[PDB]
Amino acid sequence: SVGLIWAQSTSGVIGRDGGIPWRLPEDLAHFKRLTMGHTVVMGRRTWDSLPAAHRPLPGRRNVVVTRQTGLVAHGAQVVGSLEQALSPAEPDAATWVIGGAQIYALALPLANRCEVTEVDVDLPPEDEDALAPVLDQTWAGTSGEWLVSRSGLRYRMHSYRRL
Numbered sequence: 001s002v003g004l005i006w007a008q009s010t011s012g013v014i015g016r017d018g019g020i021p022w023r024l025p026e027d028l029a030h031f032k033r034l035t036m037g038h039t040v041v042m043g044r045r046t047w048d049s050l051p052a053a054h055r056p057l058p059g060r061r062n063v064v065v066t067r068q069t070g071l072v073a074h075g076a077q078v079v080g081s082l083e084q085a086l087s088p089a090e091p092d093a094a095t096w097v098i099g100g101a102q103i104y105a106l107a108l109p110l111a112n113r114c115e116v117t118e119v120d121v122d123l124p125p126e127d128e129d130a131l132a133p134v135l136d137q138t139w140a141g142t143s144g145e146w147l148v149s150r151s152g153l154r155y156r157m158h159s160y161r162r163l
Ligand SMILES: NC(=O)c1ccc[n+]([C@@H]2O[C@H](COP(=O)([O-])OP(=O)(O)OC[C@H]3O[C@@H](n4cnc5c(N)ncnc54)[C@H](OP(=O)(O)O)[C@@H]3O)[C@@H](O)[C@H]2O)c1
Pocket: 005, 006, 007, 008, 013, 014, 015, 016, 017, 018, 019, 020, 042, 043, 044, 045, 046, 047, 049, 065, 066, 067, 068, 080, 081, 082, 098, 099, 100, 101, 102, 103, 104, 130
């Protein structure tokens, strides 16, 4: 099973300036809970965005997708395409595609689940922003309640599965 997991503003932004333009501790915890013990597949720019104590993401098999065959990525497995990332020599019952926008677009046709955090934060998109994928009629989902973070933002989790 191949799942995507992301957090987006209601406006659809996932990334800006090499990071994530809000602070949502409940989402970091959600991400860690869902992914721990599993494979996490990411694009090279997302690998480069990980803060020091999270590069590699502890307790998970980190797979980095790049066209730079010689790339050094200590703590991760480097592969040359998304298809390679999803064709491991050692299978995993759960593989999560963890971003970014480029890789989500390639992975969406191959996935059967999306776990989405929606963040009610006013962020008019800017020209270099990374944006969330859009789920069409081949997906259906369920939504948790709107919650308020201890740090102030309204957020909610959605779970989608391929019809
Ligand atoms: N909010 C969230 O849930 C979330 C999650 C993850 C990331 N982010 C944010 O999103 C941003 C990064 O996303 P992004 O869209 O810019 O980049 P990305 O998807 O993480 O990485 C793009 C890179 O992947 C590689 N790649 C893309 N297509 C490929 C292909 N067909 N074959 C091989 N390699 C391929 C290339 O690496 P090379 O250039 O090395 O060849 C490319 O530059 C950051 O701001 C990050 O903080 C947010």
